[PDB]
Amino acid sequence: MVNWAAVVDDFYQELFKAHPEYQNKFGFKGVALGSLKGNAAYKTQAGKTVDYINAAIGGSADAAGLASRHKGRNVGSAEFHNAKACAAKACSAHGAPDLGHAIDDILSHL
Numbered sequence: 001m002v003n004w005a006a007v008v009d010d011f012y013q014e015l016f017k018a019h020p021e022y023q024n025k026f027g028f029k030g031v032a033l034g035s036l037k038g039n040a041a042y043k044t045q046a047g048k049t050v051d052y053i054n055a056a057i058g059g060s061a062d063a064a065g066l067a068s069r070h071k072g073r074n075v076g077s078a079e080f081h082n083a084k085a086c087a088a089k090a091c092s093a094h095g096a097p098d099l100g101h102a103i104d105d106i107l108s109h110l
């Protein structure tokens with residue numbers, strides 16, 4: 001088992017450090033980066049990202065559905081290219097396989 005939860009945590013750290021304004025689109029808006037793990041709303045969003053990763057690896061992930069749902073938050077290609085940079089970093093830091101291919105499936109719909 002890859003510690004996906006831990007990777008998701010680093011990933012969120014990377015993403016919000018580089019694009020802090022992204023964080024305003026969540027229910028943990030305005031919460032200090034170093035406090036995220038103590039915030040209920042974050043805890044739920046992180047679990048869901050981990051779920052998706054496990055579904056992408058599992059073969060059950062609906063990439064088109066996730067893309068439409070991000071479109072529904074005015075989150076598009078540019079954001080998911082940025083996230084690809086951030087996940088690459090967070091995976092590499094954990095010796096975990098990269099999620100470039102899964103992130104690519106999402107991009108193919110954005």
Ligand code: HEM
Nearest residue numbers: 022023025026027048049052069073075079080083087103
């Ligand atoms: C690898 C990249 C990402 C993955 C795997 C991912 C995963 C998810 C998942 C699984 C959900 C819940 C889907 C649902 O049931 O509606 C979600 C919601 C969301 N995503 Fe992403 N995320 C990604 C990147 C981003 C980025 C770059 C942004 C830009 C801000 C973003 C913004 C949001 C927002 C605002 C929500 C809903 C928040 C809420 O309901 O409170 N995501 N994401």
Ligand SMILES: [Xe]
Nearest residue numbers: 008011087099
């Ligand atoms: Xe991710």
Ligand SMILES: [Xe]
Nearest residue numbers: 056099102103
């Ligand atoms: Xe992913």
